[PDB]
Amino acid sequence: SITKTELDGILPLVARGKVRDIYEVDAGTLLFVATDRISAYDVIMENSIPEKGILLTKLSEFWFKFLSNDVRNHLVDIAPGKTIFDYLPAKLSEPKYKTQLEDRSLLVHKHKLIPLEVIVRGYITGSAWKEYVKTGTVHGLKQPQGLKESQEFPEPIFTPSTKAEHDENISPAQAAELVGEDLSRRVAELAVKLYSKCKDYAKEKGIIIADTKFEFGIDEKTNEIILVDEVLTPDSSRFWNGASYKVGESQDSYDKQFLRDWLTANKLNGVNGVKMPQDIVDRTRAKYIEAYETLTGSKWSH
Numbered sequence: 001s002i003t004k005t006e007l008d009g010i011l012p013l014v015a016r017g018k019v020r021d022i023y024e025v026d027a028g029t030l031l032f033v034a035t036d037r038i039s040a041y042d043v044i045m046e047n048s049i050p051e052k053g054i055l056l057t058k059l060s061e062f063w064f065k066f067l068s069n070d071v072r073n074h075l076v077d078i079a080p081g082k083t084i085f086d087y088l089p090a091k092l093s094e095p096k097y098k099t100q101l102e103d104r105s106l107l108v109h110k111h112k113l114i115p116l117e118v119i120v121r122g123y124i125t126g127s128a129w130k131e132y133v134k135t136g137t138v139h140g141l142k143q144p145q146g147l148k149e150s151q152e153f154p155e156p157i158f159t160p161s162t163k164a165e166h167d168e169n170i171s172p173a174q175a176a177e178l179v180g181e182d183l184s185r186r187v188a189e190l191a192v193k194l195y196s197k198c199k200d201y202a203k204e205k206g207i208i209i210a211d212t213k214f215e216f217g218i219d220e221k222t223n224e225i226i227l228v229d230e231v232l233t234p235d236s237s238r239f240w241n242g243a244s245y246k247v248g249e250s251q252d253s254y255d256k257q258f259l260r261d262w263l264t265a266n267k268l269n270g271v272n273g274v275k276m277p278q279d280i281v282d283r284t285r286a287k288y289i290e291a292y293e294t295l296t297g298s299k300w301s302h
């Protein structure tokens with residue numbers, strides 16, 4: 001596994017998030033390195049899931065292509081017969097660095113950020129369900145009465161959040177205050193379009209994507225909106241097994257239930273520095289491979 005990248009200053013670090021290590025390539029370009037780190041109950045595990053970051057990078061490359069005629073993205077075009085390493089300083093091709101970067105890294109253009117977590121919900125679950133049970137609203141938005149847990153909304157809904165800085169669920173009106181009325185409306189409409197297309201596809205493959213979180217940027221030189229993070233993975237979305245879907249109850253987490261159940265059984269939920277046992281690592285890894293193969297139609301290792 002690649003847990004924490006160590007590039008010895010060859011590129012400056014921009015950020016280390018829960019999963020991605022982000023480096024600055026040059027004035028206009030970033031390198032997004034998806035590590036094998038995994039979180040549960042909003043803490044990072046001590047150890048990693050081998051090749052998780054490769055699988056999730058590739059899954060997202062699949063979705064960018066799937067959506068190529070629907071939305072611009074931040075990827076830098078890599079010329080035919082070249083690799084990312086041709087676009088990086090020579091030292092990063094040395095074995096000690098190439099091993100940390102190969103297959104899990106994306107070269108991306110910097111863009112003007114739109115500072116919103118653009119969540120679209122197709123189904124009522126998570127924090128939305130919690131709110132709804134108490135007050136009959138979702139992100140302050142009035143909902144129909146009688147929704148059951150995990151039920152589909154009449155139409156998928158834009159339900160923005162800030163970024164922590166935990167994240168705060170906000171209304172569309174607040175999003176308009178933050179980023180502008182016109183821009184927020186356009187972001188909302190686009191995100192719902194992208195979500196619906198991908199949710200429908202995934203459902204025919206057997207996975208219900210209950211919700212997903214996008215991040216967008218803008219081209220100030222055209223007003224165009226651009227995806228500025230990778231999309232539609234189990235880290236950015238709530239995946240459920242479609243065959244087992246049943247309203248009125250919670251769904252197993254497609255990706256993380258095995259891990260969550262182990263943590264819960266040991267009173268380790270929310271605890272930092274927790275090493276997952278090998279059987280939990282292996283099974284979680286296998287579940288990422290199954291997600292990847294199911295959604296992309298490609299084979300991981302054959």
Ligand SMILES: N[C@@H](CC(=O)O)C(=O)O
Nearest residue numbers: 039040041042043253256
């Ligand atoms: N999605 C993770 C959230 C986290 O632990 O950061 C979970 O399934 O519990």
Ligand SMILES: N[C@@H](CC(=O)O)C(=O)O
Nearest residue numbers: 072073074075076077109
């Ligand atoms: N590759 C373009 C985006 C696009 O092709 O739509 C860019 O990096 O800005």
Ligand SMILES: N[C@@H](CC(=O)O)C(=O)O
Nearest residue numbers: 176179180181182183184
């Ligand atoms: N109509 C918006 C502009 C935007 O789309 O950001 C406003 O100035 O509030």
